[PDB]
Design an enzyme around this catalytic site. Sequence first.
Site, short mmCIF file in Angstrom:
data_model
loop_
_atom_site.label_atom_id
_atom_site.label_comp_id
_atom_site.label_asym_id
_atom_site.label_seq_id
_atom_site.Cartn_x
_atom_site.Cartn_y
_atom_site.Cartn_z
N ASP A 44 -7.76 -5.70 -6.32
CA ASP A 44 -6.31 -5.31 -5.43
C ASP A 44 -5.57 -5.34 -6.92
O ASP A 44 -5.61 -5.30 -7.90
CB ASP A 44 -5.65 -7.23 -5.56
CG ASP A 44 -4.79 -6.87 -4.98
OD1 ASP A 44 -4.35 -7.86 -4.26
OD2 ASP A 44 -4.03 -7.68 -6.29
N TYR A 49 1.95 -3.26 -11.40
CA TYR A 49 0.99 -3.63 -12.89
C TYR A 49 0.79 -2.73 -14.17
O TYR A 49 0.32 -3.07 -14.79
CB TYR A 49 -1.02 -4.51 -11.95
CG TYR A 49 -0.90 -5.49 -10.72
CD1 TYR A 49 0.26 -6.50 -10.81
CD2 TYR A 49 -1.59 -5.16 -9.82
CE1 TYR A 49 0.69 -6.69 -10.08
CE2 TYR A 49 -1.64 -6.56 -9.15
CZ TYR A 49 -0.36 -7.29 -8.86
OH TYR A 49 -0.50 -7.97 -8.30
N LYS A 78 0.31 -2.61 -2.95
CA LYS A 78 0.69 -2.76 -2.58
C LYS A 78 2.94 -2.25 -3.16
O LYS A 78 2.89 -1.43 -4.47
CB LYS A 78 1.33 -4.36 -3.29
CG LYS A 78 0.36 -4.98 -3.15
CD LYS A 78 0.10 -6.12 -4.34
CE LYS A 78 -0.71 -6.62 -4.42
NZ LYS A 78 -1.27 -7.21 -5.76
N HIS A 111 4.55 -6.04 -1.00
CA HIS A 111 4.74 -6.98 -1.96
C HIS A 111 5.51 -8.23 -2.45
O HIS A 111 4.49 -9.33 -2.94
CB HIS A 111 4.78 -6.05 -3.47
CG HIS A 111 4.21 -6.69 -5.02
ND1 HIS A 111 3.55 -6.18 -5.85
CD2 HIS A 111 3.98 -8.02 -5.64
CE1 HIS A 111 3.26 -6.80 -6.88
NE2 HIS A 111 3.06 -7.90 -6.56
N1 LIG Z 1 0.71 -10.56 -4.67
C1 LIG Z 1 1.35 -10.73 -5.29
O1 LIG Z 1 2.11 -11.52 -5.88
C2 LIG Z 1 0.00 -11.60 -6.55
C3 LIG Z 1 0.58 -12.17 -8.25
C4 LIG Z 1 -0.24 -13.09 -8.39
C5 LIG Z 1 -1.54 -12.63 -8.50
N2 LIG Z 1 -1.93 -11.28 -7.66
C6 LIG Z 1 -2.98 -10.59 -7.83
O2 LIG Z 1 -4.19 -11.60 -7.67
C7 LIG Z 1 -5.18 -11.22 -8.86
C8 LIG Z 1 -5.61 -12.67 -9.87
O3 LIG Z 1 -4.87 -13.56 -9.59
P1 LIG Z 1 -4.27 -13.97 -11.16
O4 LIG Z 1 -4.26 -12.72 -12.67
O5 LIG Z 1 -2.72 -14.30 -11.41
O6 LIG Z 1 -5.36 -15.12 -11.67
P2 LIG Z 1 -6.41 -15.60 -11.70
O7 LIG Z 1 -6.87 -14.46 -11.66
O8 LIG Z 1 -6.14 -16.87 -11.15
O9 LIG Z 1 -6.85 -15.70 -13.79
C9 LIG Z 1 -6.84 -14.49 -14.05
C10 LIG Z 1 -7.19 -15.39 -15.69
O10 LIG Z 1 -8.77 -15.61 -15.60
C11 LIG Z 1 -9.65 -15.50 -16.61
N3 LIG Z 1 -10.38 -15.81 -16.18
C12 LIG Z 1 -10.95 -14.61 -15.30
N4 LIG Z 1 -12.35 -15.50 -14.68
C13 LIG Z 1 -13.29 -16.42 -15.99
C14 LIG Z 1 -13.57 -17.80 -15.97
N5 LIG Z 1 -15.24 -16.88 -14.99
N6 LIG Z 1 -13.70 -18.27 -16.97
C15 LIG Z 1 -12.55 -18.47 -17.48
N7 LIG Z 1 -11.94 -18.01 -17.66
C16 LIG Z 1 -12.00 -16.38 -16.47
C17 LIG Z 1 -8.77 -14.36 -16.66
O11 LIG Z 1 -9.44 -13.93 -18.22
P3 LIG Z 1 -9.88 -12.58 -18.72
O12 LIG Z 1 -9.36 -10.92 -17.79
O13 LIG Z 1 -9.88 -12.24 -20.41
O14 LIG Z 1 -11.35 -12.09 -18.38
C18 LIG Z 1 -7.24 -14.64 -16.82
O15 LIG Z 1 -7.38 -14.83 -17.88
C19 LIG Z 1 -3.73 -10.40 -9.89
O16 LIG Z 1 -4.86 -10.25 -10.88
C20 LIG Z 1 -3.42 -9.64 -8.77
O17 LIG Z 1 -4.58 -8.68 -8.12
C21 LIG Z 1 -0.87 -10.88 -7.16
C1 LIG Z 2 9.86 -13.30 -16.43
C2 LIG Z 2 9.13 -12.58 -16.96
O1 LIG Z 2 9.99 -11.53 -17.55
O2 LIG Z 2 7.65 -12.33 -16.90
C3 LIG Z 2 7.30 -11.40 -18.08
C4 LIG Z 2 6.78 -11.70 -19.02
C5 LIG Z 2 6.24 -10.46 -20.00
C6 LIG Z 2 5.85 -9.26 -19.22
C7 LIG Z 2 6.22 -9.33 -18.26
C8 LIG Z 2 6.39 -10.21 -17.06
C9 LIG Z 2 6.62 -9.93 -15.85
O3 LIG Z 2 7.90 -10.71 -14.91
N1 LIG Z 2 5.51 -9.26 -14.90
C10 LIG Z 2 5.21 -8.90 -13.56
N2 LIG Z 2 4.45 -7.92 -13.09
C11 LIG Z 2 4.54 -8.15 -11.76
C12 LIG Z 2 5.04 -8.73 -11.20
N3 LIG Z 2 5.65 -8.91 -10.28
O4 LIG Z 2 4.69 -8.37 -8.72
O5 LIG Z 2 6.84 -9.20 -9.38
S1 LIG Z 2 6.32 -9.79 -13.10
#
Ligand SMILES: NC(=O)c1ccc[n+]([C@@H]2O[C@H](COP(=O)([O-])OP(=O)(O)OC[C@H]3O[C@@H](n4cnc5c(N)ncnc54)[C@H](OP(=O)(O)O)[C@@H]3O)[C@@H](O)[C@H]2O)c1
Ligand SMILES: CC(=O)Oc1ccccc1C(=O)Nc1ncc([N+](=O)[O-])s1
EC number: 1.1.1.21
Length: 316
Positions: A44, A49, A78, A111
């Site tokens: 993804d 990003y 996205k 997005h």
């Molecule tokens: N469409 C959207 O608007 C949107 C919004 C948010 C996210 N996303 C997508 O969804 C993806 C995942 O969501 P997210 O990045 O917000 O957070 P997440 O996947 O819920 O969590 C990521 C965090 O969890 C840690 N982690 C991963 N595996 C772990 C494990 N087995 N044990 C302990 N900690 C672990 C990672 O650490 P390390 O990386 O340091 O290992 C990182 O700090 C994003 O990267 C992005 O691709 C999309």
């Molecule tokens: C609130 C704010 O300013 O949070 C931050 C603080 C520090 C660095 C980055 C962000 C931030 O907003 N990052 C993002 N990446 C992707 C985004 N999206 O898809 O909307 S928003």
Amino acid sequence: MASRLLLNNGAKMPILGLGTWKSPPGQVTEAVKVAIDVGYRHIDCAHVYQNENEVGVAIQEKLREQVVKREELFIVSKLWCTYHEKGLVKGACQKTLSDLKLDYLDLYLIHWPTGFKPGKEFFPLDESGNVVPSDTNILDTWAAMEELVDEGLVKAIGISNFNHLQVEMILNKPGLKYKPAVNQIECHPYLTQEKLIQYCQSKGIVVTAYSPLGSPDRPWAKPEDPSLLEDPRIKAIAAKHNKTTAQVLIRFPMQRNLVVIPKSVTPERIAENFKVFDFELSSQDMTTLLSYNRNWRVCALLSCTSHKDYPFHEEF
Ligand SMILES: NC(=O)c1ccc[n+]([C@@H]2O[C@H](COP(=O)([O-])OP(=O)(O)OC[C@H]3O[C@@H](n4cnc5c(N)ncnc54)[C@H](OP(=O)(O)O)[C@@H]3O)[C@@H](O)[C@H]2O)c1
Ligand SMILES: CC(=O)Oc1ccccc1C(=O)Nc1ncc([N+](=O)[O-])s1
């Protein structure tokens, strides 16, 4: 449990993918390479990003190494909010393709439903701290997305952070050519999305669950915030299955027929997060995890609460 879900474009989408938000350019290449080696076939990505080039390097090297074929990978990106204008959509997609070094995307999502003023700021804000919007609407932006399918730039198009009325608006668009294949939304035990999931699934739209681990590295995290990974109720469930809390939190959306995209740059975790096809959460585990819902959002887009297309005023 099957490993891929059938989309309404006829393609199959791996139910587990690697997230890349917050993955630094200097680490995401190694992260994607390791994910590919251990069996991830879905990555993804997003322009916003700021690391799509380095993701593309990893993909390109694994193709060159004959580790995987292009048709075996499912790459998602996205369209950023500043490119919602119909005339900017194609160019934004081509920029992402150029960065990722790919001929096509398997899935390209809007997005956020909110269009922002076009220009060289990801987030144009004014003195009130509110975003500067664009003169765009989701139906015209959707029409421009649809053209990318006919032009062969993407195999599937979809949406992200759309509420059910926004999905319904697209589904009822005059001149609609393609239904969204996917709605990617935040989903985890503190935000269970029961109605929006039921709605999308009833329409043949696959749901992808983002921030499944609660995004513990989110840049706005505070010590008083809840923590899914440290929730003792969830630890208890994990202990029972001899799995980690992360593994339970990843398996959870899988059993609801969602795609799930946990992010990691840590090789051991990338491997650990993939080991989720060898156990099942019980029916009661699932009901219990669902009972923890608090409608608590990691991504609430608080700079855009006054935007006409802000998605989180509606109930779902
Ligand atoms: N469409 C959207 O608007 C949107 C919004 C948010 C996210 N996303 C997508 O969804 C993806 C995942 O969501 P997210 O990045 O917000 O957070 P997440 O996947 O819920 O969590 C990521 C965090 O969890 C840690 N982690 C991963 N595996 C772990 C494990 N087995 N044990 C302990 N900690 C672990 C990672 O650490 P390390 O990386 O340091 O290992 C990182 O700090 C994003 O990267 C992005 O691709 C999309
Ligand atoms: C609130 C704010 O300013 O949070 C931050 C603080 C520090 C660095 C980055 C962000 C931030 O907003 N990052 C993002 N990446 C992707 C985004 N999206 O898809 O909307 S928003």
